[PDB]
Design a protein around this ligand. Structure first.
Ligand code: CLA
Ligand code: CLA
Ligand code: CLA
Ligand code: CLA
Ligand code: CLA
Ligand code: CLA
Ligand code: CLA
Ligand SMILES: CC1=C(/C=C/C(C)=C/C=C/C(C)=C\C=C\C=C(C)\C=C\C=C(C)\C=C\C2=C(C)CCCC2(C)C)C(C)(C)CCC1
Ligand SMILES: CC1=C(/C=C/C(C)=C\C=C/C(C)=C/C=C/C=C(C)/C=C/C=C(C)\C=C\C2=C(C)CCCC2(C)C)C(C)(C)CCC1
Ligand SMILES: CC1=C(C/C=C(\C)CCC[C@H](C)CCC[C@@H](C)CCCC(C)C)C(=O)c2ccccc2C1=O
Ligand SMILES: CC1=C(C/C=C(\C)CCC[C@H](C)CCC[C@@H](C)CCCC(C)C)C(=O)c2ccccc2C1=O
Ligand code: SF4
Ligand code: SF4
Ligand code: SF4
Lengths: 30, 75, 49, 138, 97, 728, 164, 80
């Protein structure tokens, strides 16, 4: 059912880069 | 005769090698299995705190005080 | 232009475009990239904007 | 607690030169004979009591050495020596490997001395487009 | 000191441009071999102090090529400077026209 | 003899059969200095009080102006009589091209530019009165420069003079105390009682103008002062043996201040200046000299030891005796706050009559009198350097307390470095929040007074106690030691306000922790660069480049700004950021929340609002309401007499500006240039031979320093000014 | 008892600049830095830092309430350990992305032999991958509970720190 | 790892290149100048754009600089 699209923003700011500074942490230890 | 010490400072910690340990545990850990609880970890609150109404907000409804989305005009 | 070589260091030709400054070298050298003239260039232009 | 160590070098405990984590990726040592305990200026600060040996003391930036060899130039003093020294010991030293004094000049000292450009001829240097084998370098 | 109404932002962004400008300054006026030297004298302190001792760090903290230390002078700056006038030229006009 | 130049002077290679412009600021940039002179004291001691000379002959050359250009064109008389409304003026200016309006015409029958910084208030303080008078003291002090500048020629010249009895240091350190303070303090009392006290007490109502008891009186015969505060004035002074109690009358610890016009009591300033007068007369004999009474010179200091802190603080230097540089930090950090001390003091609790109410100098003054202080200390210990890289000889030290530091570097500096994040980084990083929390951040809940409150509060502190302090506890004195602190026991005068219970709180353990910050990461800059400076853990050997010395390696991947000379080249900037802060906090307290006006129903009315409290929390609040809420003063302010402050920070903003061009810029870039043009002259044969090279690195970390650092000052003095006066 | 190791630095060769004073090694109970994972050379993760976790979690019941958002409010006095678990779980990652300054893949460990083990050269690299990461099973297991144990129990205070 | 390229004539010294910090200095004997001497680096691996190596070192056109690209914990200097 309904209410959102917040789905995106807690990503694009919250986990996504949490995963940027995560997997290229790296680039070094990529 | 031995001016001691510590040096060897206090009993080698409690009969506690058990339950915490092993049991539960998110554990084994890294490389593979880490994401395994930092994937939920970060899609948890997120995901489910990228909703739950209806509701909980800061709160405000029914645009009036000399009407509004008007005037007046219409519905 | 003359950042082709100069005569200060008549060989930035080798050196290139993007060499970070110089050091005390015969008190008479510093920030010297033809790059770091684009640096300064991008100052006066945002001035001229 | 206490001993081995027989330095002198000496001034005791402070931070400001030679630390914890470079018993690995290099280390560097220095030898000489010490005219008197004849105290002088010695990095972290102190003043060191020179002694009747030594002269062997630890210090990582071999930077610090010649400096100190010549540091030993404002009380009169002479013949600095250094070494390396690391896991597991070996090099790393110009005085003496033969103490060739960088100045002098003497025996057989090698090539590696300079561009087919006796410089003036300097310009746009386009003898390059993806050199391979071709220069990497000179 | 009452509220925000609808021109709230640059009232933030602007002082942003008015910060984010500004500190494209340290990098700029504050050149190079003052950073290492210092960032040693404690790249060091946190190499001694127990409990947070077992932490040796994957590579090894240095200060910044002098170029850079003129670049990020340029993209804090301009970014600041692209900012504000940026937010002003807009702010301005939604009040007055 | 001798002399004269001509090429070559002291920078060994000066003449050089020249070759290039840029010597004319190697000389202009060596010239005074030493070692690029010599510590050979028998020709350097005999420069320092040579001096040291003129500076006075200049200070004289000074003051002898500030009465001629007082008493050749008063506002002094044409006002004095009437403090209150109608105020200062010491310059009126020739009628060239529209100078005029610059000399206002607003001072009581006087055309002229209005004047900020007491003086009127400094000379209505003693008494003097009559222009033909401290004009009879304009001449008192101008030749009176002469002879003091006739000391250059006195010694040195026909008299190569003495280090033998310069080096020693006991007569002078005793006599300054006694000697030439002690000719003073109390021999201002004879003045402050007889001259000063009553030509004020009887000013304090009647005595309007011209019949003004020319000080001429009140010597040999009393009767009149006698007719005033008594003392029984026969020819026998009681307190020769303890009738003290009587010759008192007019000097019991009165504290507060003269409510018939602020200042504070002259009935409260002989007891202050014959006690702190004579300690300095007696306590200015404690050292050796000749006659077997005295102390260690240094023989005291090595007196004591301590295990760690070892030897103690021992055998305290022997150039500390010798010469300047070694010494030269201490007479400055000291003198340092000894101009931030008198500052946070003066406004803080008024001297000479007519301040508290005033403004345009219960501010103005306040500053400068804090620049000089900041300036002075925040460039005092660039003398710790030089010294090590200089005046320090072979040895005197190891196991000295000194070395105990130079060892314990890296891990003394260091543990400041962090405070200097926490303290700041996050305690300034703290208006920020409440911006992100006023814009974004809904009063709902954040860091201000009815906010991150903090209810009663913040106290008080203490101060307050400073207000039970005179009613018991230090038995008396009078009225609460300085109205600024205390409870609600509240005064003023002159319609407008004077000083009152200036209550703190949030807005107060805020800000502060910035001066509280700053003067952390403004020292250690300083200490980092004061300790490493000669031995730096990363070019380890410095005394191998000089004091200034640019940087060094493009190697080690980026060695620059290593010198303390350049640790000082930004040692400053911040001060300016720190002195040229702090002033600020001040001028929005005094005002908005201290200055007043009067009306009546219980209601003081400030220059601006009790705003501040919650519209100077958030960082911003200081441009909302500290700029465009002000500046109006100066923004419009043309065609008038604010017509200079509409004319300064203009060419003060440029010349904050025309810094970065020399300071952000390159240096090789510029030299690289001054050919190109060269072709024009040369080919067309004109061209120099002092080969016109382009300004030496250091030299241009010797301008965007001055220039920046001329720039954002005047500016703020072009500014803060004209605020005060009409909404002043 | 007879004075002590003062002046003459850091043990050994008067030139190894870590440093010795009190707050290095001392009677007044350096003892600390030696029963939480601190010094010793010690033993075996989990039961070293499941202590950190255990302790480290509730340590934040603080700046998770009057500080931040809602001081005291609805939803509510769940203060103590809100997302305070939530805003661990990266603190509970972070050092599980650390695993680069520790590598091996197994833990013997554990006794020691005779002989000795924790062999005469520790200060440094004993610890490993699948050699440290089960300390990480601690702090996190410990974090939560380190959080959660401050919730279920108590919240109109009591005499807990009095000193100590 | 030291750069770029740097050039002939001087030595002897007694008034030129006598002061690299991190060594990087022999002096071969070689035949050309007014007694015998050609040089840059019997080394360049200890150095370090210690670029004080021409300040003491004349002879005409660029004469010392750095180019470390790789730039190395040997001569990026940072030990600890
Ligand atoms: C990059 C992303 C971006 C995004 C999408 C968010 C999103 C959020 N921030 Mg935020 N924040 C950001 C950048 C961002 N922030 C930056 C750059 C800063 C400062 C440098 C902050 C400083 C900040 C503060 C101080 C706070 C937030 C809070 C929050 C949460 C908002 C209110 C709430 O009820 O949270 C509910 C969301 C969670 C509890 C997240 C749980 C997710 C775990 C499980 C992972 C929300 C998740 C606030 C909060 O949680 O209230 C106390 C408050 O803490 N942020
Ligand atoms: C005390 C200092 C101060 C400083 C350092 C600055 C600095 C700046 N202001 Mg500014 N400003 C200030 C006070 C200051 N302002 C005040 C008191 C006001 C009145 C509220 C303004 C109103 C203002 C406006 C409206 C604008 C600026 C802009 C700017 C930027 C353009 C300048 C430039 O690139 O130079 C070359 C000339 C610059 C970073 C402009 C901007 O937003 O673009 C970056 C914009 O036009 N300022
Ligand atoms: C801080 C010092 C200051 C100074 C520099 C002077 C100086 C002077 N006072 Mg004086 N005085 C002072 C404080 C001072 N006073 C104070 C605080 C009081 C109140 C006790 C007085 C009460 C006073 C009286 C009553 C007289 C003087 C007189 C004098 C003068 C002559 C004394 C004499 O002939 O020696 C004589 C030496 C003796 C020991 C007797 C002389 C100018 C006398 C005067 O005006 O004519 C001579 C007059 O006697 N004074
Ligand atoms: C006791 C105080 C006072 C006095 C008498 C001096 C005296 C001196 N200072 Mg000095 N100084 C002071 C306060 C003082 N300073 C303060 C507060 C600071 C911090 C800002 C400095 C920072 C300072 C530096 C960085 C240097 C000096 C230097 C000198 C010496 C040469 C200055 C000169 O005329 O060169 C001629 C230069 C000019 C005339 C250019 C100045 C610009 C003019 C136009 C104004 C001279 C011994 C120099 C020195 O000791 O030599 C190594 C130099 O290194 N001072
Ligand atoms: C909650 C609130 C918040 C959001 C913060 C946030 C912070 N504090 Mg902090 N602090 C707080 C309350 C808070 N504190 C309180 C109530 C106290 C005691 C009254 C402190 C005593 C404190 C200290 C001593 C330090 C911090 C530091 C810090 C910073 C941690 C290091 C870093 O992030 O870089 C961070 C900005 C640290 C810092 O600035 O550098 C490490 C510093 O160590 N805080
Ligand atoms: C569009 C913009 C423009 C620009 C580019 C500037 C730029 C500047 N202004 Mg300025 N100003 C402007 C518009 C502008 N202003 C307007 C419209 C007004 C009101 C009509 C002012 C009123 C003003 C004043 C009163 C002052 C400046 C000062 C300055 C300079 C700050 C120098 C410094 O290093 O200390 C900045 C360091 C700080 C810590 C500032 C703290 C400010 C907040 C956070 C409190 C800088 C050149 C000042 C100066 O040179 O000395 C401080 C000061 O004199 N301006
Ligand atoms: C955030 C800030 C805030 C809002 C708090 C809030 C709290 N802390 Mg706390 N704390 C903080 C920073 C903060 N702390 C810091 C920086 C430290 C380092 C010492 C502590 C160390 C600390 C300890 C040891 C304790 C608390 C305890 C507490 C709670 C006392 C009730 C209790 O559970 O006793 C239990 C009965 C309370 C929730 C007490 C606690 O939570 O105990 C379970 C416990 O006494 N704190
Ligand atoms: C071309 C020409 C010219 C022009 C000029 C001009 C146009 C100028 C301007 C400029 C600008 C555009 C700016 C500037 C300004 C100035 C200034 C700015 C000055 C200063 C100063 C001073 C000396 C001061 C001091 C002080 C103090 C004491 C402290 C406080 C503050 C103050 C500032 C007050 C001339 C005439 C030369 C000649 C001919 C031609
Ligand atoms: C004991 C100890 C210690 C201590 C330390 C201290 C004392 C402090 C610190 C502190 C700190 C360190 C603080 C901080 C904290 C934090 C907080 C209070 C919160 C926050 C934040 C942040 C940072 C974030 C943001 C976010 C989130 C959280 C989510 C996601 C994303 C975002 C962005 C939204 C030492 C050093 C000795 C070492 C170790 C042990
Ligand atoms: C502050 C400063 C430093 C020190 C630089 C430091 C301490 C950098 C430390 C990293 C900071 C803490 C990072 C903050 C922002 C970055 C993470 C942003 C880039 C991230 C994306 C590209 C991923 C210099 O080394 C320097 C050198 C020459 C001239 C001026 C300066 C200078 O001003
Ligand atoms: C412009 C500039 C120069 C060149 C500036 C110079 C050479 C100063 C000019 C000196 C004076 C003004 C000579 C000009 C002529 C005057 C003496 C008087 C003639 C003009 C009238 C008053 C008659 C540098 O050397 C430099 C160095 C390092 C960083 C930045 C810079 C920089 O920005
Ligand atoms: S010449 Fe300038 S930028 Fe280059 S290394 Fe030296 S001070 Fe640094
Ligand atoms: S670098 Fe110095 S020593 Fe070598 S040839 Fe040139 S001038 Fe001579
Ligand atoms: S970079 Fe220059 S100073 Fe450093 S070793 Fe090489 S030639 Fe010598």
């Amino acid at each position: 059912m309904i209410n959102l699209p917040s789905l995106f923003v807690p990503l694009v700011g919250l986990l996504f880069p949490a995963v940027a500074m995560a997997s290229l942490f790296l680039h070094v230890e990529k | 005769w031995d001016v001691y010490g510590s040096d060897a400072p206090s009993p080698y910690n409690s009969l506690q090698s058990k339950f915490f340990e092993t049991f539960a545990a998110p554990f084994t850990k890294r490389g593979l299995l880490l994401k395994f609880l930092i994937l939920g970890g970060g899609s948890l609150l997120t995901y489910v705190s990228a909703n739950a109404p209806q509701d909980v907000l800061p709160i405000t409804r029914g645009p009036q005080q000399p009407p509004k989305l008007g005037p007046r005009g219409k519905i | 232009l003359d950042a082709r070589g100069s005569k200060l260091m008549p060989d930035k030709k080798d050196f290139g475009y993007s060499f970070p400054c110089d050091g005390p070298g015969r008190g008479g050298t510093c920030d010297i990239s033809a790059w770091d003239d684009f640096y300064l260039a991008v100052f006066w232009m945002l001035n001229t904007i | 607690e206490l001993d081995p160590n027989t330095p002198s070098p000496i001034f005791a405990g402070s931070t400001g030169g030679l630390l914890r984590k470079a018993q690995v990726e290099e280390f560097y040592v220095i030898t000489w004979e010490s005219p008197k305990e004849q105290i002088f200026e010695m990095p972290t600060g102190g003043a060191a009591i020179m002694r009747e040996g030594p002269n062997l003391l630890k210090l990582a930036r071999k930077e610090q050495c010649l400096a100190l060899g010549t540091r030993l130039r404002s009380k009169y003093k002479i013949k600095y020596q250094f070494y390396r020294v690391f896991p597991s010991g070996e090099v790393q030293y110009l005085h003496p490997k033969d103490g060739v004094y960088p100045e002098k000049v003497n025996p057989g000292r090698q090539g590696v001395g300079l561009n087919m450009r006796s410089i003036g001829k300097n310009v746009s240097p386009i003898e390059v487009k993806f050199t391979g084998k071709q220069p990497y370098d000179l | 000191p009452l509220v925000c109404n609808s021109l709230s932002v640059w009232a933030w962004m602007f002082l942003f441009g008015h910060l984010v400008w500004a500190t494209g300054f340290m990098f700029l006026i504050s050149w190079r071999g003052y950073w290492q030297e210092l960032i040693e004298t404690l790249a060091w302190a946190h190499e001694r102090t127990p409990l947070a001792n077992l932490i040796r760090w994957r590579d090894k903290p240095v200060a910044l090529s002098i170029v850079q230390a003129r670049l990020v002078g340029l993209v804090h700056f301009s970014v600041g400077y692209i900012f504000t006038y940026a937010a002003f030229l807009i702010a301005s006009t939604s009040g007055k026209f | 003899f001798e002399q004269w130049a001509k090429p070559g002077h002291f920078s060994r290679t000066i003449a050089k059969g020249p070759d290039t412009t840029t010597w004319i600021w190697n000389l202009h940039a060596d010239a005074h200095d030493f070692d690029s002179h010599t510590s050979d004291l028998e020709e350097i001691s005999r420069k320092v009080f040579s001096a040291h000379f003129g500076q006075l002959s200049i200070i004289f050359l000074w003051l002898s102006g500030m009465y001629f250009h007082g008493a050749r064109f008063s506002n002094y008389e044409a006002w004095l009589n009437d403090p209150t409304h109608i105020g200062p003026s010491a310059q009126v200016v020739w009628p060239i091209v529209g100078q005029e309006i610059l000399n206002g015409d607003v001072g009581g029958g006087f055309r002229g530019i209005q004047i900020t910084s007491g003086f009127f208030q400094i000379w209505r303080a003693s008494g003097i009165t009559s222009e033909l008078q401290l004009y009879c003291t304009a001449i008192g002090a101008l030749v009176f420069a002469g002879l003091m500048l006739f000391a250059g020629w006195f010694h040195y010249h026909k008299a190569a003079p003495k280090l033998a009895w310069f080096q020693d240091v006991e007569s002078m350190l005793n006599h300054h105390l006694a000697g030439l303070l002690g000719l003073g303090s109390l021999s201002w009392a004879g003045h402050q009682v007889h001259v000063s006290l009553p030509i004020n007490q009887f000013l304090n109502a009647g005595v309007d103008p011209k019949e003004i008891p020319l000080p001429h009186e009140f010597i040999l015969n009393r009767d009149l002062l006698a007719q005033l505060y008594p003392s029984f004035a026969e020819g026998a002074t009681p307190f020769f043996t303890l009738n003290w109690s009587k010759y008192a009358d007019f000097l019991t610890f009165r504290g507060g201040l003269d409510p018939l016009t602020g200042g504070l009591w002259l009935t409260d300033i002989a007891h202050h200046h014959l006690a702190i007068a004579i300690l300095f007369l007696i306590a200015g004999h404690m050292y050796r000299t000749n006659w077997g009474i005295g102390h260690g010179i240094k023989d005291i200091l090595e007196a004591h030891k301590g295990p760690f802190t070892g030897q103690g603080h021992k055998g305290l230097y022997e150039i500390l005796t010798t010469s300047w540089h070694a010494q030269l930090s201490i007479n400055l950090a000291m003198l340092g706050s000894l101009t931030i001390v008198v500052a946070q003091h003066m406004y803080s609790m008024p001297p000479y009559p007519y301040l508290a109410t005033d403004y345009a100098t219960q501010l103005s003054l306040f500053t400068h009198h804090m620049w000089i202080g900041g300036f002075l200390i925040v460039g005092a210990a660039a003398h710790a350097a030089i010294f090590m890289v200089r005046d320090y000889d072979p040895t005197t030290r190891y196991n000295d307390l000194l070395d105990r530091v130079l060892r314990h570097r890296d891990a003394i500096i260091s543990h400041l470095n962090w405070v200097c994040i926490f303290l700041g980084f996050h305690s300034f990083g703290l208006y920020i929040h409440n911006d992100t929390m006023s814009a974004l951040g809904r009063p709902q809940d954040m860091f201000s007074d009815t906010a991150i409150q903090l209810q009663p509060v913040f106290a008080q502190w203490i101060q307050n106690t400073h207000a039970l302090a005179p009613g018991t506890t230090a038995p008396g004195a009078t009225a609460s030691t300085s109205l600024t602190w205390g409870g609600g026991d509240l005064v003023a005068v002159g319609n407008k306000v004077a000083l009152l219970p200036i209550p703190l709180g949030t807005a107060d353990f805020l800000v502060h922790h910035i001066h509280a910050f700053t003067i952390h990461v403004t020292v250690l800059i300083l200490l980092k660069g004061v300790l490493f400076a000669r031995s730096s853990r990363l070019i380890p050997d410095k005394a191998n480049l000089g004091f200034r010395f640019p940087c060094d390696g493009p190697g080690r991947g980026g060695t620059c700004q290593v010198s303390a000379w350049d640790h000082v080249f930004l040692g400053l900037f911040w001060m300016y950021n720190s002195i040229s802060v702090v002033i600020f906090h001040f001028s929005w307290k005094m005002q908005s929340d201290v200055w007043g006006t009067i009306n009546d129903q219980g209601v003081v009315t400030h220059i601006t609002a009790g705003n501040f409290a919650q519209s100077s929390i958030t960082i911003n609040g200081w441009l909302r309401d500290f700029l465009w809420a002000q500046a109006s003063q100066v923004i419009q302010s043309y065609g008038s007499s604010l017509s200079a402050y509409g004319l300064f920070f203009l060419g003060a903003h440029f010349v904050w500006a025309f810094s970065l061009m020399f300071l952000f810029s390159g240096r090789g870039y510029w030299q690289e240039l001054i050919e190109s043009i060269v072709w024009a002259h040369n080919k067309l044969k004109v061209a120099p031979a002092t080969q016109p090279r382009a300004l030496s690195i250091v030299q241009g970390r010797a301008v965007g320093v001055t220039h920046y650092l001329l720039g954002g000052i005047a500016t703020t003095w072009a500014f803060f000014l004209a605020r005060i006066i009409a909404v002043g | 008892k007879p004075t002590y190791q003062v002046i003459q630095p850091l043990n050994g060769d008067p030139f190894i600049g870590g440093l010795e004073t009190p707050v290095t090694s001392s009677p007044l109970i350096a003892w600390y830095l030696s029963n939480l994972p601190a010094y010793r050379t010690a033993v075996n993760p989990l039961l070293r830092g499941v202590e950190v976790g255990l302790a480290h979690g509730f340590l934040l019941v603080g700046p998770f309430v009057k500080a931040g958002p809602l001081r005291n409010t609805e939803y509510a006095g769940a203060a103590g350990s809100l997302a305070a678990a939530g805003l661990v779980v990266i603190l509970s990652m972070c050092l599980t992305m650390y695993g680069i300054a520790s590598f091996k893949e197994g833990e013997p460990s554990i006794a020691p032999a005779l002989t000795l083990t924790g062999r005469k050269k520790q200060p440094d690299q004993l610890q490993s991958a699948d050699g440290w990461a089960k300390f990480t099973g601690g702090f996190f297991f410990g974090g939560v509970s380190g959080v959660t144990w401050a919730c279920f129990l108590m919240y109109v205070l009591d005499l807990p720190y009095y000193f100590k | 790892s030291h750069s770029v390229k740097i050039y002939d004539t001087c030595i002897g010294c007694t008034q030129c290149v006598r002061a690299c910090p991190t060594d990087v200095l022999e002096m071969i004997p070689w035949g050309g100048c007014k007694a015998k001497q050609i040089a840059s680096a019997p080394r360049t691996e200890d150095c370090v754009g210690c670029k004080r190596c021409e300040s003491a070192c004349p002879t005409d056109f660029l004469s010392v600089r750095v180019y470390l690209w790789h730039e190395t914990t040997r001569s990026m200097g940072l030990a600890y």
